[PDB]
Design a protein around this nucleic acid. Sequence first.
RNA 1: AACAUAAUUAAUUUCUAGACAUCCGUUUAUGAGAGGAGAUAAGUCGUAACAAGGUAAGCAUACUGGAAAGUGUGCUUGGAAUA
Length: 52
Amino acid sequence: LASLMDKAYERKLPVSSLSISRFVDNIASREDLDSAEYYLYKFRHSPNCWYL
RNA sequence: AACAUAAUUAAUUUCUAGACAUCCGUUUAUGAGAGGAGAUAAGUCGUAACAAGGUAAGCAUACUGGAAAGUGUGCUUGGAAUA
Ligand SMILES: [K+]
Ligand SMILES: [K+]
Ligand SMILES: [K+]
Ligand SMILES: [Mg+2]
Ligand SMILES: [Mg+2]
Ligand SMILES: [Mg+2]
Ligand SMILES: [Mg+2]
Ligand SMILES: [Mg+2]
């Protein structure tokens, strides 16, 4: 899932609310939170920020 | 080359990338050298035309000649024509 979102930002394409939802749901470790925090930041600064 | 994301306010992105470089030609300038026309203006050689200009003149054309010009053939009068 990380790769999918990264490609979208590289191509300046909108990311789905379902995509960010799947990431947060499947957090399984303390380290994963740090990555999700970065992707929550990226989602906020993206065209579909309102749809969180 | 023209799709793909997204969508419980709604929008994002694509909506391209080469090759428009030479031209085939076309004008003008330059002019080795070879000619023409005109004027300069004392000359040279002849006297072709104007008088029946001393072989009437001229036209087209041909040949010939230092040069005007000469000769032929048909045509014209812008000549003459009684012995
Ligand atoms: K004569
Ligand atoms: K004479
Ligand atoms: K005469
Ligand atoms: Mg005579
Ligand atoms: Mg004579
Ligand atoms: Mg003649
Ligand atoms: Mg003769
Ligand atoms: Mg003779």
